[PDB]
CSV table of C-alpha atoms and ligand atoms in Angstrom, one decimal:
chain,number,residue,atom,x,y,z
T,1,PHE,CA,0.0,0.0,0.0
T,2,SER,CA,2.6,2.5,-1.1
T,3,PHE,CA,2.6,3.8,-4.8
T,4,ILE,CA,-1.1,2.8,-4.8
T,5,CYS,CA,-1.9,6.1,-3.1
T,6,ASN,CA,-0.3,8.1,-5.9
T,7,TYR,CA,-2.9,6.4,-8.1
T,8,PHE,CA,-6.0,7.0,-5.8
T,9,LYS,CA,-5.0,10.7,-5.0
T,10,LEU,CA,-5.9,11.3,-8.7
T,11,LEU,CA,-9.5,10.0,-8.4
T,12,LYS,CA,-12.3,12.1,-7.0
T,13,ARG,CA,-13.5,9.0,-5.0
T,14,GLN,CA,-11.5,6.1,-3.7
T,15,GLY,CA,-14.6,4.0,-3.0
T,16,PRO,CA,-18.1,3.4,-4.5
T,17,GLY,CA,-20.7,6.1,-3.9
T,18,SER,CA,-22.6,9.1,-5.4
T,19,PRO,CA,-24.1,12.4,-4.4
T,20,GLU,CA,-27.5,10.6,-4.3
T,21,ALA,CA,-26.4,7.9,-1.9
T,22,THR,CA,-24.9,10.4,0.6
T,23,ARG,CA,-28.0,12.6,0.3
T,24,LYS,CA,-30.2,9.6,0.9
T,25,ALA,CA,-28.3,8.5,4.0
T,26,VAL,CA,-28.7,12.1,5.2
T,27,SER,CA,-32.5,11.9,4.8
T,28,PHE,CA,-32.5,9.4,7.7
T,29,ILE,CA,-30.7,11.4,10.3
T,30,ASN,CA,-32.0,14.3,12.3
T,31,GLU,CA,-31.6,17.9,11.3
T,32,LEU,CA,-28.4,19.6,12.5
T,33,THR,CA,-27.5,23.1,13.4
T,34,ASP,CA,-24.4,25.2,12.5
T,35,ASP,CA,-23.2,24.3,16.0
T,36,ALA,CA,-23.3,20.6,15.3
T,37,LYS,CA,-20.1,18.5,15.2
T,38,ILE,CA,-19.6,16.0,12.3
T,39,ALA,CA,-16.9,13.5,11.6
T,40,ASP,CA,-16.2,11.7,8.4
T,41,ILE,CA,-13.9,8.7,9.2
T,42,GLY,CA,-11.7,7.4,6.4
T,43,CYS,CA,-12.6,10.4,4.4
T,44,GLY,CA,-10.0,10.0,1.7
T,45,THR,CA,-9.7,12.9,-0.7
T,46,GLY,CA,-13.1,14.1,0.7
T,47,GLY,CA,-15.2,13.3,-2.3
T,48,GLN,CA,-18.2,12.4,-0.3
T,49,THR,CA,-17.4,14.8,2.5
T,50,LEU,CA,-18.2,17.8,0.3
T,51,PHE,CA,-21.5,16.3,-0.8
T,52,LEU,CA,-22.3,15.9,2.9
T,53,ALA,CA,-21.2,19.5,3.3
T,54,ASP,CA,-24.1,20.6,1.2
T,55,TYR,CA,-26.6,18.4,2.9
T,56,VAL,CA,-26.1,19.1,6.6
T,57,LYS,CA,-25.2,22.0,8.8
T,58,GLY,CA,-22.3,21.8,11.3
T,59,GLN,CA,-18.5,21.6,11.6
T,60,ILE,CA,-17.3,18.7,9.5
T,61,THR,CA,-14.0,17.0,10.3
T,62,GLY,CA,-12.6,14.5,7.8
T,63,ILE,CA,-10.0,12.1,9.1
T,64,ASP,CA,-7.8,9.8,7.0
T,65,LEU,CA,-4.5,8.0,7.5
T,66,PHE,CA,-2.7,9.3,4.5
T,67,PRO,CA,-1.5,12.9,4.6
T,68,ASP,CA,-1.4,13.1,0.8
T,69,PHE,CA,-5.2,12.7,0.8
T,70,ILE,CA,-5.8,15.2,3.6
T,71,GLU,CA,-3.6,17.6,1.6
T,72,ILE,CA,-6.1,17.5,-1.3
T,73,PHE,CA,-9.0,17.6,1.1
T,74,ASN,CA,-8.2,21.0,2.4
T,75,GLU,CA,-7.1,22.1,-1.1
T,76,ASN,CA,-10.7,21.4,-2.2
T,77,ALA,CA,-12.2,22.8,1.0
T,78,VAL,CA,-10.6,26.2,0.1
T,79,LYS,CA,-11.6,25.9,-3.5
T,80,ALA,CA,-15.2,25.5,-2.3
T,81,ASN,CA,-15.4,28.4,0.2
T,82,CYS,CA,-16.0,26.2,3.2
T,83,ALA,CA,-12.6,25.8,4.8
T,84,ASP,CA,-14.2,27.3,7.9
T,85,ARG,CA,-16.5,24.3,8.7
T,86,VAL,CA,-14.8,21.7,6.4
T,87,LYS,CA,-11.4,20.8,7.8
T,88,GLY,CA,-9.3,17.7,7.2
T,89,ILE,CA,-6.7,16.3,9.5
T,90,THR,CA,-4.5,13.2,9.4
T,91,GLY,CA,-5.3,10.5,11.9
T,92,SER,CA,-6.2,6.8,12.5
T,93,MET,CA,-9.4,4.9,12.6
T,94,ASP,CA,-8.4,2.8,15.6
T,95,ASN,CA,-7.5,5.9,17.7
T,96,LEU,CA,-9.6,9.0,17.1
T,97,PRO,CA,-8.9,12.5,18.5
T,98,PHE,CA,-12.5,12.9,19.7
T,99,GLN,CA,-13.7,13.5,23.3
T,100,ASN,CA,-16.5,11.2,24.4
T,101,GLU,CA,-20.0,12.4,23.4
T,102,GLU,CA,-18.5,15.3,21.3
T,103,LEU,CA,-19.9,14.3,18.0
T,104,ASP,CA,-23.5,14.6,16.6
T,105,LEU,CA,-22.8,12.6,13.5
T,106,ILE,CA,-20.2,10.0,12.4
T,107,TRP,CA,-19.9,9.4,8.7
T,108,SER,CA,-17.8,6.8,6.8
T,109,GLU,CA,-18.0,5.5,3.2
T,110,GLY,CA,-16.3,2.4,2.1
T,111,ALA,CA,-13.8,2.6,5.0
T,112,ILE,CA,-15.3,0.8,8.0
T,113,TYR,CA,-13.8,-2.4,6.5
T,114,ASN,CA,-10.3,-1.3,7.6
T,115,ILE,CA,-11.2,-2.0,11.3
T,116,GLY,CA,-14.1,-4.3,11.0
T,117,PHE,CA,-17.8,-3.4,10.9
T,118,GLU,CA,-18.7,-4.5,14.4
T,119,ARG,CA,-15.5,-3.2,16.0
T,120,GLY,CA,-16.0,0.3,14.4
T,121,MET,CA,-19.7,0.4,15.5
T,122,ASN,CA,-18.8,-0.2,19.1
T,123,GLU,CA,-15.5,1.7,19.3
T,124,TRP,CA,-16.8,4.8,17.6
T,125,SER,CA,-20.0,4.9,19.7
T,126,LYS,CA,-18.0,6.5,22.6
T,127,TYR,CA,-17.5,9.7,20.6
T,128,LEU,CA,-21.2,10.1,19.9
T,129,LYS,CA,-23.8,12.1,21.8
T,130,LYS,CA,-27.0,10.2,23.0
T,131,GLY,CA,-29.4,10.6,20.1
T,132,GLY,CA,-26.6,11.2,17.7
T,133,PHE,CA,-26.4,9.3,14.4
T,134,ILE,CA,-23.9,7.1,12.6
T,135,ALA,CA,-24.1,6.4,8.9
T,136,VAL,CA,-21.7,4.1,7.1
T,137,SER,CA,-21.6,2.3,3.7
T,138,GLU,CA,-20.3,-1.2,3.7
T,139,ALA,CA,-19.9,-4.1,1.3
T,140,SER,CA,-22.4,-6.9,2.0
T,141,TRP,CA,-24.1,-10.0,0.6
T,142,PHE,CA,-27.5,-9.9,-0.9
T,143,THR,CA,-28.2,-13.6,-0.7
T,144,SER,CA,-27.6,-16.6,1.6
T,145,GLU,CA,-25.2,-18.2,-0.9
T,146,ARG,CA,-23.2,-16.9,-3.8
T,147,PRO,CA,-20.9,-18.2,-6.7
T,148,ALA,CA,-17.5,-19.6,-5.7
T,149,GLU,CA,-15.3,-17.1,-7.6
T,150,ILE,CA,-17.0,-14.0,-6.0
T,151,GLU,CA,-17.1,-15.6,-2.5
T,152,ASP,CA,-13.4,-16.3,-2.6
T,153,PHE,CA,-12.5,-12.7,-3.6
T,154,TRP,CA,-14.2,-11.3,-0.6
T,155,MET,CA,-13.4,-14.0,2.0
T,156,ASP,CA,-9.8,-13.1,1.2
T,157,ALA,CA,-10.2,-9.4,0.8
T,158,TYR,CA,-12.6,-8.8,3.6
T,159,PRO,CA,-13.6,-11.8,5.8
T,160,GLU,CA,-16.1,-9.8,7.8
T,161,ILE,CA,-18.3,-9.4,4.8
T,162,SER,CA,-21.7,-10.6,6.0
T,163,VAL,CA,-25.4,-10.5,4.9
T,164,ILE,CA,-27.4,-7.4,5.5
T,165,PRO,CA,-29.4,-9.0,8.4
T,166,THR,CA,-26.2,-9.7,10.2
T,167,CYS,CA,-24.9,-6.1,10.0
T,168,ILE,CA,-28.1,-4.6,11.4
T,169,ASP,CA,-27.9,-7.2,14.1
T,170,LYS,CA,-24.4,-5.9,15.0
T,171,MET,CA,-25.9,-2.3,15.1
T,172,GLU,CA,-28.3,-3.1,18.0
T,173,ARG,CA,-25.5,-4.8,19.9
T,174,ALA,CA,-23.5,-1.6,19.8
T,175,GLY,CA,-26.5,0.3,21.1
T,176,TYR,CA,-27.9,1.7,17.9
T,177,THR,CA,-31.5,2.0,16.9
T,178,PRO,CA,-31.3,0.5,13.3
T,179,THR,CA,-33.0,3.6,11.7
T,180,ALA,CA,-32.4,2.4,8.1
T,181,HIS,CA,-30.3,0.7,5.5
T,182,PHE,CA,-30.4,0.7,1.7
T,183,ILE,CA,-28.4,-0.9,-1.1
T,184,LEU,CA,-26.3,1.5,-3.1
T,185,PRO,CA,-27.4,2.1,-6.7
T,186,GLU,CA,-25.3,0.4,-9.4
T,187,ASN,CA,-24.2,3.8,-10.8
T,188,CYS,CA,-22.3,4.3,-7.6
T,189,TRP,CA,-19.9,1.6,-8.7
T,190,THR,CA,-19.7,2.1,-12.5
T,191,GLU,CA,-20.3,5.8,-13.0
T,192,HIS,CA,-18.6,7.1,-9.9
T,193,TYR,CA,-15.9,4.6,-9.1
T,194,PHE,CA,-14.9,2.5,-12.2
T,195,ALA,CA,-15.5,4.9,-15.2
T,196,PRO,CA,-13.2,7.5,-13.6
T,197,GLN,CA,-10.5,4.9,-13.4
T,198,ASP,CA,-10.3,4.8,-17.2
T,199,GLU,CA,-9.6,8.6,-17.4
T,200,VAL,CA,-6.3,8.0,-15.7
T,201,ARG,CA,-5.4,4.5,-16.9
T,202,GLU,CA,-3.1,5.3,-19.8
T,203,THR,CA,-1.2,8.1,-18.2
T,204,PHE,CA,-0.6,5.6,-15.4
T,205,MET,CA,0.1,2.3,-17.4
T,206,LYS,CA,2.9,4.3,-19.1
T,207,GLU,CA,4.8,5.3,-15.9
T,208,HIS,CA,4.7,1.8,-14.5
T,209,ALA,CA,4.5,-0.5,-17.6
T,210,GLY,CA,7.7,-2.3,-16.7
T,211,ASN,CA,7.0,-2.7,-13.0
T,212,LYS,CA,5.7,-6.2,-12.0
T,213,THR,CA,4.0,-5.0,-8.8
T,214,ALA,CA,2.3,-2.0,-10.4
T,215,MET,CA,1.0,-4.3,-13.1
T,216,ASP,CA,-0.5,-6.9,-10.8
T,217,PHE,CA,-2.2,-4.0,-9.0
T,218,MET,CA,-3.6,-2.6,-12.2
T,219,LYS,CA,-4.8,-6.0,-13.2
T,220,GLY,CA,-6.4,-6.1,-9.7
T,221,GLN,CA,-8.3,-2.9,-10.4
T,222,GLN,CA,-9.5,-4.2,-13.7
T,223,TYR,CA,-10.4,-7.6,-12.1
T,224,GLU,CA,-12.7,-5.8,-9.7
T,225,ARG,CA,-14.9,-4.4,-12.5
T,226,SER,CA,-15.0,-7.8,-14.1
T,227,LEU,CA,-16.3,-9.2,-10.8
T,228,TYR,CA,-18.8,-6.5,-10.4
T,229,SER,CA,-20.2,-6.7,-13.9
T,230,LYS,CA,-20.5,-10.5,-13.4
T,231,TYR,CA,-21.8,-10.6,-9.8
T,232,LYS,CA,-23.6,-7.3,-9.3
T,233,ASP,CA,-26.5,-9.5,-8.3
T,234,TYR,CA,-24.8,-11.0,-5.2
T,235,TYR,CA,-22.9,-8.2,-3.5
T,236,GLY,CA,-22.3,-4.5,-3.2
T,237,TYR,CA,-22.2,-1.5,-0.9
T,238,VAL,CA,-24.9,-1.0,1.6
T,239,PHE,CA,-25.6,2.2,3.6
T,240,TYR,CA,-26.4,1.6,7.3
T,241,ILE,CA,-27.8,4.4,9.4
T,242,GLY,CA,-28.3,4.2,13.1
T,243,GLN,CA,-29.0,6.3,16.2
T,244,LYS,CA,-27.1,6.0,19.5
T,245,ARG,CA,-29.5,5.2,22.3
V,1,SAM,C1,-12.1,2.9,0.0
V,1,SAM,S1,-11.3,4.4,0.5
V,1,SAM,C2,-12.8,5.5,0.7
V,1,SAM,C3,-12.4,6.9,0.8
V,1,SAM,C4,-13.7,7.8,0.9
V,1,SAM,N1,-14.4,7.5,2.1
V,1,SAM,C5,-14.6,7.6,-0.3
V,1,SAM,O1,-15.6,6.9,-0.1
V,1,SAM,O2,-14.2,8.1,-1.4
V,1,SAM,C6,-10.7,3.9,2.2
V,1,SAM,C7,-10.2,5.1,3.0
V,1,SAM,O3,-9.8,4.7,4.3
V,1,SAM,C8,-8.6,5.3,4.6
V,1,SAM,N2,-7.9,4.6,5.7
V,1,SAM,C9,-7.4,3.4,5.7
V,1,SAM,N3,-6.9,3.0,6.9
V,1,SAM,C10,-7.2,4.0,7.7
V,1,SAM,C11,-7.1,4.2,9.1
V,1,SAM,N4,-6.4,3.2,9.8
V,1,SAM,N5,-7.5,5.3,9.6
V,1,SAM,C12,-8.1,6.2,8.9
V,1,SAM,N6,-8.3,6.1,7.6
V,1,SAM,C13,-7.9,5.0,7.0
V,1,SAM,C14,-7.8,5.1,3.3
V,1,SAM,O4,-6.7,5.9,3.3
V,1,SAM,C15,-8.9,5.6,2.3
V,1,SAM,O5,-8.9,7.1,2.4
């Protein structure tokens, strides 16, 4: 996970999503005030953080591991006239710089997988006020059994990938009222995640054409689309919205 970041820092989104998905997740939380405190964990370049910026009031704080991403985050915050309430800082997902019950809303798209769904649900709770909301998108199964090929890919990539019923079950455990959940539209993958990867494929494939590692990675990125186009009926990203009791 080194040069890879120099690939993703180009893209406007490092994970599947769309302005519609973020906006729909927002429709399930309570209205916020300019004095609210928001946190987008695993924000990345901040592609979805800015969408969220137009959908809710409050001070948003994006947190990512890689400083190169955070660097672009603020770059965009300033180019959007909202550097005042939209600020990105480098940090970790398993050790957040938040006081207990300081946050009104915890956001996270295609990043919870880094520390485990259940673990994140419980560990992040601490930082949320009573009645506060948490909204995260996560890859999940849509059926009870799927094809071998696709099953392998995930069980190896992310072992905690479970069916939707199981995730919601983990939400109650962590003390969350399972407000809602919805599968992410197919365009979130193809239009907003894959299609943009073609805009920067050639410029890239040139700089690393002779590198074995870089090639196996590129083939990996192309293998994901192949898998999605072939098993878009068995898995995908699911948005989970809950309210801390
Ligand atoms: C799939 S990307 C999604 C980025 C952004 N949420 C989006 O949807 O466009 C995963 C993000 O999690 C970040 N990340 C990985 N490990 C992390 C950690 N330990 N703490 C915080 N962020 C982390 C990665 O750097 C990356 O920005």
